[PDB]
Ligand binder design. Structure first.
Ligand SMILES: CCCCCCCCCCCCCCCCCC(=O)OC[C@H](COP(=O)(O)OCCN)OC(=O)CCCCCCCCCCCCCCCCC
Ligand SMILES: CCCCCCCCCCCCCCCCCC(=O)OC[C@H](COP(=O)(O)OCCN)OC(=O)CCCCCCCCCCCCCCCCC
Ligand SMILES: CCCCCCCCCCCCCCCCCC(=O)OC[C@H](COP(=O)(O)OCCN)OC(=O)CCCCCCCCCCCCCCCCC
Ligand SMILES: CCCCCCCCCCCCCCCCCC(=O)OC[C@H](COP(=O)(O)OCCN)OC(=O)CCCCCCCCCCCCCCCCC
Ligand SMILES: CCCCCCCCCCCCCCCCCC(=O)OC[C@H](COP(=O)(O)OCCN)OC(=O)CCCCCCCCCCCCCCCCC
Ligand SMILES: CCCCCCCCCCCCCCCCCC(=O)OC[C@H](COP(=O)(O)OCCN)OC(=O)CCCCCCCCCCCCCCCCC
Ligand SMILES: CCCCCCCCCCCCCCCCCC(=O)OC[C@H](COP(=O)(O)OCCN)OC(=O)CCCCCCCCCCCCCCCCC
Ligand SMILES: CCCCCCCCCCCC(=O)OC[C@H](COP(=O)(O)OCC[N+](C)(C)C)OC(=O)CCCCCCCCCCC
Ligand SMILES: CCCCCCCCCCCC(=O)OC[C@H](COP(=O)(O)OCC[N+](C)(C)C)OC(=O)CCCCCCCCCCC
Ligand SMILES: CCCCCCCCCCCC(=O)OC[C@H](COP(=O)(O)OCC[N+](C)(C)C)OC(=O)CCCCCCCCCCC
Ligand SMILES: CCCCCCCCCCCC(=O)OC[C@H](COP(=O)(O)OCC[N+](C)(C)C)OC(=O)CCCCCCCCCCC
Ligand SMILES: CCCCCCCCCCCC(=O)OC[C@H](COP(=O)(O)OCC[N+](C)(C)C)OC(=O)CCCCCCCCCCC
Lengths: 105, 69, 158, 491, 642
């Protein structure tokens, strides 16, 4: 679908793209003081393109952004233990609560 | 805590934090049972075991080699 | 034990509830299934269907047969493989081998001494084991000569 | 005494059940008294008859001599000579033990006509049991094919949705192939004027005639084990036949092919069997490997177990065609061990899950251990028996069969060891899924294994482990009988 | 006494397995711990009798296989090699069971866990004490059975379920080769008994010896996670940490080493196999350490260290130095179980229960006792002089150079790098978890507290064993001329003396310099110059980092190529054979043929005078025609059917 800047569906696409940018920075950079420098550099690059009207510019930028995010993706991201993909995910799931149906077998 | 559905799921191992009310009584019986035939293992082992390096004298083995020669 | 007077009570009470799907003092014997009149057999089922209608996985009718006929049958099979006085061919051959050693070495004082004191239960336990027995000369004599007679049956060579 | 009593008693049992249950057909429209509780009394009489048949073979077992060479209990009945040796004695007892199990597995999961089913089960058991005690080729063929008549009707009446397809498959695959075996039997009776076991065992035929006779017999045997590429009837028949039909098919019927090799090929066509062994090994090895890889892609629970049976019976065929005692004993023990584990896996897959959910698609079942822990224990235990884990009779059968193949043919017999890996690949892929993850969203929680289904599983597991730990109970009986099958002239 | 050492853990398995419902969670754990401890005291009593007094024990229960000449008995014998193997197994098993009492106290299923853990212990005792190879194979298989149930213990977790299957199937691949080696042993020697087979080692054909031990080598790779069959090892981390502390220390990962050391009377008479063991061990030491330097899960890092150290045992076996391999096998079980235990201590202590070292940092003060155990265990792992790892690992690395062959020289550098990489990934693990700036939330550090005394006690006991143990036991296994006839060394292969006297003094300290010197340089970069480790900048560094973090891309290659094509072959057979040509040459194909033929014949039955008169008169040609034309008439008739 075409991109309409300043729309609600554009404030969710850029926001998610910014999340994946910062998470990828966090996976690669494991020191908090070093992460803040990279986190601000990423944000300033978002601020530069913040005021753009032409969708024909945004789609060129949006396609390029995913090229960088996919290229810089960490092969081993950081996942919380109980989240999907974590070390404790689906461990000791409580059983389903439902009355047993008796059968004659 | 949670719901373990213990009404009908009673596996031999217990099913989600199962400790019966009479667990002290049963534990002594099992400890007696474990100890009783743990000695039975010892009594059997001492009777049945042997040293395979002392069953035949070295003089008996020299005759075997020559006879089989 | 049909007890027709008892069914009439059972039949009537189910009639006190016209609605449907909305006793332990009852039993039958082997002679009843073949000798009751056709009228009475109809009554018993009409109650049995309705008694069961007014209702886990027990008293199914097989437990007595399998635990009086089948499990003792497997026990008897287990006993036979355990305590039946049957020699196999490999167990016979070891006994025959010791017998021929005795016959070839009658003039042997040492060997016959061990053969006589070698009990029948330890014949298959020859060698190193927990039993303290003297078979050193017995093993010595088997290693010396060959006590089989296979060469005496193949009278044709190349 | 054995055959005469085993036939006369069962005829009286067949007639007794017919007389009781058919005395009221004549527009009585009554309610009877034997029809109550799904014909409980008629079921119980047939159950008792099956157990008594096990008692008859025992009375003749007490007098069996394991140190006698030749057939024992030699009897004449219906102008036919009947005899038993070490090999036959164990297969008869295996056949009769499964009789009560087949009846009890279908104790309450038939839509009706319980008297017919019980008679057919007892009729199938006796005909198969009598096939191990006949002493001529024609009597072997008569009992080999007589089972088709009740088995065809058993599938078509009590079968699943595709029962019509399965009934035709078993009748046509087995009858057409056995007629080729009949051609070889007719040739024996023409040139030798007898089909007696001992008479034909001493005759050496021309190497060209032995080839034609071997091919005729092997066609009938290869379809009934089954071997590739004539195996396509078995998965269809197993998925649609009733539970008792699957137990007898997977426990006895397939073992008649191995006994066919023992009687109809090894002692009479000895010279040509050595020629055919490389061909037999190639066919069996590819049967083992192909069936294991095909089993991976299956989606039906009862078809997965059906393909598992083909892989292990290829190993039995490999062992029996080894020309040594290790392979022959290993093949026979594997036949008995399979005769208990394979019916147990059909009870777990097609007798417990199917009786509760009536669907054999693999996609509906997972995480069963959450609400069926007892089922999961037996499922896991029998899965490791089915892959030849040590302490099970399957391993003792498999290890000696593989060892016998290696001794027979060191190069190509070594491929038999793929049974160890491939059997665990498809069997533990199914078990890891039924016992894995969250309890399935497509299932409602219901009862666990009942007392009857526990009883069936326990008494199929017990013989497997007793044989696995102390197989000398079986090897002592087989030792002198198996040693007669070896053909070699060492100079 | 011998029956007590072997079967007592099996009774503990049964009690928590079937009587767990009746004695409850608390008493089930301790009674199983009681059964293992009885085996501990029994083993120590037997250790004195066997090693120090040259007494052998043998209990022959009954016969197992009695098929003609092949006779296999249910016999268990305890000799120097067997009783030495029980020392790591039973001791570490006891200290892992006691560890699991408090570690698993929050788990809803504890009776089942201690049943599998004790059943695993019994199987390993069976493997090392059986009198023949078949009894070893019984323990060999049930170790894989128990490992499958332990790795998939949390069976609602999809990852644990598929990891348990992965470990079982790869080991079952090794079992299939082990069975073939046993079948070939029966073919060549007629026996599987150790006493028979080992007496014939010198007189048997080299090719027959090579075939049997190549089969043993493949089985050894699967269990010991050597290169090629090592993929399941890191998937085994899906199980509870006590499983990892046991499987990877004195258990299944060491079973492959034992099988090769047991077969030394045969293995010495085939140099080609020993050469393969040398290279396969050398490759796995190098690869494991390189992967472990860029790994981020704390248990994966320790698991890769286990693979690296087992490969150190393989190179020792390759140069026929069986005594060094057995000694390093015993010592490794002590400080590697400690490292797994002290890793599980940190994971429990942090309230988020993270396992990623990138989310750790600044833990040294808050958990000082856990840090001390890791520190000492790492130094023992790093073969710091004076410690137990120093007396067992330094000699093995130097023995590669003491071989003075081409292969020995190559593998010395592989071992040297692995020795250097061992220091590198140990310091990196310690820095990230303990010495780095805090990466966790502030709430984590105010709640970061040490665990109870039941968790602590086994770690202290193993900590002392990781300090002194190697020095005390060195002379039993490494002393010159010490009699260990179970481990046979051919006189042509004795290299312990040129190893001890001919090496340069620079090589005597070269592993120590690179590890200590390299470790300090690595530590400085993290603390002061971390900008060099932002490898996402450089594209070549990112690709080199990604290659090792993804474990030499082996798991991808195995799943995407070998496993995918293995399942696709079954699909092709299913589609084109079973549902394909066998239906065309079967029911579906014959149904179409029958329908075509029967439709033709149905058109020939109709009441018509002319039709039947023509056929009657046509048949008269059979009388006129000469009989040689019958087959042409037969061909013509089949044409008309079409
Ligand atoms: C469910 C159970 C199924 C029940 C049917 C199975 C029956 C088992 C067979 C019965 C055999 C009877 C027997 O025990 O004989 C005693 C036997 C004496 O024979 P003997 O010739 O003197 O010993 C020679 C050994 N070299 O003495 C022996 O040799 C037996 C010693 C063998 C020890 C092996 C231990 C295996 C594991 C034992 C676990 C259970 C024992 C512990 C009991 C509970 C402990 C808390
Ligand atoms: C009332 C008296 C009954 C008749 C007594 C009698 O003599 O019957 C003949 C036979 C007894 O056997 P007999 O002739 O003495 O010698 C054995 C050779 N059959 O007894 C019989 O022949 C009974 C034969 C009828 C029962 C078998 C019927 C066929 C069963 C299906 C075939 C199974 C094998 C395939
Ligand atoms: C899950 C997997 C489980 C296992 C799967 C099956 C693996 C086993 C398959 C291979 C079979 C075992 C190999 C044993 C053969 C080695 C025996 C040997 O010693 O080699 C030499 C031997 C003859 O000995 P030699 O004296 O050297 O010859 C000169 C005679 N004057 O004989 C020879 O000369 C060599 C014989 C040719 C060997 C061909 C091996 C390739 C087989 C490929 C099978 C298809 C793929
Ligand atoms: C889940 C299903 C439930 C069933 C699970 C458990 C199944 C039952 C376990 C036992 C299996 C049955 C096998 C034992 C039956 C007895 C076999 C026997 O007859 O032993 C005879 C043996 C030697 O015979 P002989 O010297 O001739 O003297 C007797 C003369 N009649 O004389 C003897 O010395 C007897 C010695 C018997 C020793 C006890 C055997 C029990 C099993 C313990 C050993 C098992 C092997 C060790 C495996 C450990 C793991 C590697
Ligand atoms: C897994 C597969 C199952 C196990 C199969 C084992 C196959 C190894 C056979 C052993 C062998 O044949 O070694 C000899 C081999 C080539 O045989 P060849 O050179 O012709 O004869 C040597 C006579 N001195 O020459 C060699 O020794 C080196 C090449 C084979 C070494 C193993 C790789
Ligand atoms: C054991 C018997 C092994 C037989 C190996 C057979 C190899 C083979 O047939 O590979 C063919 C297969 C590609 O065949 P296919 O899927 O039909 O490609 C056309 C799709 N448009 O390619 C594959 O499936 C990969 C097989 C490689 C592993 C061997
Ligand atoms: C491992 C298992 C082994 C068991 C398998 C044994 C069976 C193997 C035989 C396989 C051959 C049959 C299977 C394939 C036949 C398919 C028939 C067919 O499709 O019809 C072909 C054609 C009609 O065309 P149509 O089908 O409509 O469309 C074309 C589709 N492409 O019409 C035709 O062309 C059909 C040809 C005309 C009929 C020729 C008749 C020749 C003689 C009869 C053959 C059998 C002889 C038996 C003799 C004794 C009989 C008592
Ligand atoms: C060992 C050699 C034995 C040979 C004798 C065979 C049995 C004879 C049965 C005749 C009486 C009868 O048709 O009776 C019918 C009985 C029982 O049916 P039911 O459920 O009561 O009928 C329903 C009545 N209701 C509605 C009141 C409940 O069916 C049987 O018995 C079936 C056995 C034969 C099946 C296989 C046929 C194969 C034919 C070719 C064999 C080679
Ligand atoms: C050398 C031979 C050893 C023989 C004795 C070993 C101990 C036996 C333990 C029996 C009790 C048990 O484990 O089965 C019962 C437990 C039940 O789970 P729970 O922990 O009570 O939790 C209950 C909560 N659910 C319901 C969510 C699980 O498991 C299961 O159903 C889990 C499924 C896997 C089956 C495991 C079978 C293991 C058999 C070993 C095959 C060789
Ligand atoms: C695969 C990639 C790994 C590196 C390849 C090594 C190249 C080479 O040349 O290795 C050759 C080596 C060395 O044995 P050799 O030189 O034949 O004999 C040398 C005889 N000494 C040592 C007594 C002097 O053998 C191998 O590779 C071992 C088999 C392959 C293992 C993998
Ligand atoms: C002797 C071995 C010398 C090489 C080891 C240097 C330390 C190291 O490998 O580290 C240096 C770096 C990575 O930095 P790191 O500290 O490992 O992780 C921190 C990285 N983050 C913060 C981005 C997550 O490695 C590499 O990308 C090199 C490729 C790994 C293999 C090592 C060389 C293979 C040959
Ligand atoms: C000689 C080597 C061993 C072979 C043993 C015999 C195997 C015979 C093939 C199986 C046939 C079958 O089972 O017949 C059953 C099948 C059932 O077909 P269906 O699945 O319901 O599909 C058919 C319906 N549709 C497509 C609409 C879904 O009826 C047929 O097709 C009818 C043709 C019968 C031909 C039988 C001739 C047998 C000759 C045997 C020697 C060449």
């Amino acid at each position: 679908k075409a991109v309409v800047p300043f729309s609600e569906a554009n404030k969710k696409y850029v926001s998610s793209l910014y999340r994946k940018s910062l998470r990828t920075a966090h996976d690669w950079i494991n020191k908090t003081e070093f992460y803040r420098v990279k986190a601000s550099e990423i944000r300033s690059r978002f601020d530069a393109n913040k005021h753009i009207n032409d969708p024909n510019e945004l789609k060129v930028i949006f396609k390029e952004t995913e090229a960088l995010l996919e290229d810089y993706a960490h092969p081993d991201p950081i996942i919380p233990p109980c989240r999907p993909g974590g070390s404790k995910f689906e461990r000791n799931i409580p059983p389903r609560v439902e009355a047993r149906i008796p059968i004659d077998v | 805590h949670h719901i373990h559905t213990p009404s009908y799921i009673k596996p031999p191992t217990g099913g989600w934090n199962f400790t019966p009310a009479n667990w002290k009584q049963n534990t002594v019986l099992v400890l007696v049972g474990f100890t009783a035939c743990c000695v039975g293992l010892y009594k059997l082992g001492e009777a049945g075991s042997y040293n395979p390096k002392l069953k035949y004298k070295e003089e008996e083995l020299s005759r075997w080699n020559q006879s089989a020669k | 034990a049909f007890n027709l007077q008892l069914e009439k009570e059972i039949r009537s009470k189910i009639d006190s509830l016209p609605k449907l799907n909305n006793v332990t003092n009852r039993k039958l014997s082997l002679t009843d299934y073949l000798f009751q009149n056709a009228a009475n057999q109809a009554l018993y089922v009409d109650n049995e269907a309705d008694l069961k209608e007014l209702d886990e996985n027990e008293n199914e009718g097989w437990e007595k047969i399998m635990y009086v006929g089948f499990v003792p049958t497997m026990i008897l099979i287990f006993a036979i493989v355990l305590f039946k006085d049957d020699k196999s061919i490999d167990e016979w051959a070891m006994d025959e081998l010791l017998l021929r050693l005795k016959e070839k070495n009658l003039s042997d004082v040492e060997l016959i001494d061990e053969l006589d004191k070698l009990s029948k239960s330890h014949v298959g336990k020859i060698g190193a084991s927990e039993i303290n027995k003297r078979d050193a000369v017995i093993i010595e004599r088997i290693l010396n000569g060959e006590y089989d007679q296979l060469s005496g049956l193949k009278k044709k060579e190349l | 005494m054995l055959v005469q009593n085993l036939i006369i008693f069962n005829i009286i049992g067949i007639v007794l059940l017919v007389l009781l249950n058919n005395n009221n057909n004549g527009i009585l429209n009554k309610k009877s008294l034997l029809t109550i509780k799904n014909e409980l009394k008629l079921k119980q009489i047939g159950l008792i008859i099956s157990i008594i048949n096990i008692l008859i073979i025992i009375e003749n077992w007490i007098g069996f001599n394991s140190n006698y060479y030749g057939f024992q209990n030699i009897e004449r009945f219906l102008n036919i000579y009947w005899g038993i040796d070490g090999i036959s004695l164990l297969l008869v007892l295996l056949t009769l033990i499964l009789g009560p199990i087949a009846i009890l597995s279908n104790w309450k999961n038939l839509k009706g006509y319980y008297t017919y089913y019980v008679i057919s089960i007892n009729m199938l058991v006796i005909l198969m049991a009598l096939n191990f005690i006949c002493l001529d080729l024609v009597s072997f063929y008569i009992l080999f094919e007589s089972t088709l008549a009740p088995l065809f009707l058993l599938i078509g009446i009590y079968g699943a949705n595709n029962k019509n397809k399965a009934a035709y498959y078993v009748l046509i695959y087995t009858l057409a192939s056995s007629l080729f075996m009949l051609l070889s039997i007719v040739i024996y009776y023409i040139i030798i004027n007898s089909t007696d076991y001992i008479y034909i065992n001493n005759i050496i035929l021309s190497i060209n005639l032995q080839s034609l006779l071997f091919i005729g017999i092997i066609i009938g045997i290869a379809v009934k084990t089954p071997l590739m590429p004539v195996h396509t009837w078995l998965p269809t028949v197993h998925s649609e036949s009733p539970l008792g039909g699957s137990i007898l098919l997977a426990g006895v019927i397939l073992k008649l092919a191995i006994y066919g090799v023992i009687r109809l090929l090894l002692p009479n066509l000895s010279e040509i069997s050595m020629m055919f062994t490389p061909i037999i090994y190639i066919i069996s090895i590819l049967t083992l490997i192909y069936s294991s890889l095909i089993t991976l892609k299956q989606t039906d629970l009862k078809v997965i177990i059906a393909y598992s049976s083909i892989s292990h019976l290829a190993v039995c065929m490999i062992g029996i065609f080894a020309n040594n005692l290790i392979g022959i004993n290993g093949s026979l023990i594997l036949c008995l061990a399979h005769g208990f584990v394979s019916p147990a896996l059909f009870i777990l897959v097609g007798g417990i899950l199917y009786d509760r959910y009536h669907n054999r698609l693999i996609n509906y079942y997972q995480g069963l251990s959450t609400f069926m822990p007892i089922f999961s224990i037996y499922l896991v235990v029998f899965s490791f028996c089915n892959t030849g884990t040590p302490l099970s009779g399957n391993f003792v059968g498999e290890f000696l069969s593989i060892t016998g193949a290696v001794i027979r043919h060191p190069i190509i017999g070594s491929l038999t060891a793929a049974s160890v890996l491939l059997s665990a690949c498809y069997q533990m892929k199914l078990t890891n899924r039924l016992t894995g993850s969250v309890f399935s969203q497509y299932l409602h929680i219901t009862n666990d294994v009942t007392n009857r289904e526990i009883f069936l599983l326990n008494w199929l597991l017990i013989p497997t482990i007793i044989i696995g730990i102390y197989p000398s109970f079986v090897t002592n009986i087989l030792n002198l009988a198996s040693s007669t099958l070896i053909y070699s002239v060492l100079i | 006494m011998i029956l007590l050492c072997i079967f007592t853990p099996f009774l503990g398995s049964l009690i928590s397995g079937f009587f767990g419902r009746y004695i409850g969670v608390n008493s089930s754990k301790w009674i199983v711990c009681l059964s293992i401890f009885v085996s501990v005291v029994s083993t120590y009593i037997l250790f004195i009798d066997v090693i120090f007094n040259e007494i052998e024990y043998t209990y022959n229960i009954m016969n197992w296989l009695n098929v003609e000449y092949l006779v296999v008995d249910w016999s268990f014998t305890i000799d120097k090699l067997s009783v030495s193997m029980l020392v790591p197994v039973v001791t570490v098993s006891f200290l892992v069971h006691l560890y699991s009492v408090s570690y698993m106290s929050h788990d809803p299923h504890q009776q089942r866990f201690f049943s599998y853990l004790s059943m695993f212990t019994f199987a390993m005792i069976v493997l090392v004490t059986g009198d023949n190879y078949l009894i070893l194979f019984v323990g060999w298989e049930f170790i894989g059975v128990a490992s499958y149930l332990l790795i998939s213990f949390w069976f609602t977790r999809f990852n644990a379920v598929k990891s348990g299957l992965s470990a079982l199937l790869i080991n079952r691949f090794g079992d299939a080769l082990l069975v073939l080696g046993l079948s070939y042993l029966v073919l060549v020697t007629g026996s599987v008994n150790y006493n028979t087979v080992f007496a014939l080692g010198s007189y048997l054909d080299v090719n027959m010896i090579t075939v049997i031990l190549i089969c043993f080598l493949v089985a050894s790779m699967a269990k010991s996670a050597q290169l090629g069959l090592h993929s399941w090892l890191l998937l085994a981390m899906e199980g509870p940490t006590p499983v990892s502390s046991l499987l990877h220390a004195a258990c299944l990962v060491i079973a492959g080493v034992f099988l090769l050391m047991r077969s030394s009377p045969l293995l010495e008479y085939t140099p080609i196999v020993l050469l393969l063991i040398l290279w396969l061990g050398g490759l796995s030491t190098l690869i494991s350490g390189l992967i472990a330097m860029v790994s981020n899960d704390i248990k994966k890092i320790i698991a890769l260290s286990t693979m690296s150290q087992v490969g150190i045992m393989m190179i020792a076996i390759g140069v026929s130095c069986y005594n060094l391999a057995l000694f390093h096998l015993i010592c490794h079980s002590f400080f590697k179980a400690l490292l797994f235990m002290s890793a599980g201590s940190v994971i429990h202590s942090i309230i988020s229960e993270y396992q990623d070292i990138r989310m750790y940092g600044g833990f040294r003060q808050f958990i000082p006792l856990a840090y001390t155990c890791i520190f000492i265990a790492s130094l023992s792992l790093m073969a710091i002089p004076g410690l137990t790892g120093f007396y067992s690992k330094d000699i093995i690395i130097e023995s590669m150079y003491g071989e003075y062959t081409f292969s020995g020289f190559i593998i010395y550098w592989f071992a040297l790098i692995s020795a250097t990489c061992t220091s590198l990934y140990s310091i990196r693990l310690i820095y990230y978890t303990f010495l780095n700036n805090p990466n966790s939330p502030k709430y984590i550090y105010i709640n970061l507290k040490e665990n109870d005394i039941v968790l602590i006690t086994p770690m202290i006991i193993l900590t002392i064993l990781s300090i002194f143990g190697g020095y005390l036991l060195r002379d039993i296994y490494l002393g010159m001329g010490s009699p260990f006839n179970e481990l046979f060394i051919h006189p042509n292969n004795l290299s312990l003396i040129e190893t001890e006297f001919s090496l340069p003094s620079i090589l005597k300290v070269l592993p120590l310099i690179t590890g200590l010197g390299g470790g300090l340089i690595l530590l400085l970069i993290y603390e002061f110059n971390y900008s060099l480790f932002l490898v996402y900048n450089n594209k070549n560094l990112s690709k080199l980092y990604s290659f090792f973090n993804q474990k030499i891309m082996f798991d991808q290659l195995l799943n995407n190529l070998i496993l995918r094509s293995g399942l696709n072959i079954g699909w092709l057979l299913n589609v084109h054979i079973d549902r394909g040509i066998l239906q065309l040459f079967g029911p579906l194909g014959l149904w179409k043929l029958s329908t075509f033929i029967s439709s033709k014949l149905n058109k020939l039955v109709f009441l018509n005078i002319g039709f039947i008169l023509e056929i009657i008169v046509l048949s008269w040609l059979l009388i006129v025609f000469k009989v040689s034309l019958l087959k042409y008439i037969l061909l013509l008739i089949i044409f008309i059917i079409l």
